[PDB]
Amino acid sequence: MINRTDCNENSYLEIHNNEGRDTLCFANAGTMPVAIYGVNWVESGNNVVTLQFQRNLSDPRLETITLQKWGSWNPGHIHEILSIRIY
């Protein structure tokens, strides 16, 4: 039940990789597999959402990150996003 939204409000998750090149606003607790490479920062309005991405491609280095209300993520260009889970 997850779909790519252009953020029609100010309280959702938004991942902008490629150095703020392509942003993806997700909504609804829906949970689907996504692919986001080069993660610079992620948004997390007043909603708890889990982000599933693989740190390294060659290795199955799976990493989980939970964004709290109004939480954001600023790693430094992530390989690619695996899936996205919303609570």
Automatic annotation (TrEMBL):
Keywords of the record: Signal
Listed transmembrane segments: none
Domain Streptomyces killer toxin-like beta/gamma crystallin per the UniProt entry, residue ranges: 13-75
Disulfide bonds: 7-25
Keyword Ribonucleoprotein part of the UniProt annotation: no
Keyword Signal: yes
Name of the protein in question: Antifungal protein
Source species: Streptomyces tendae
Positions spanned in the full protein: 43 to 128 of 128
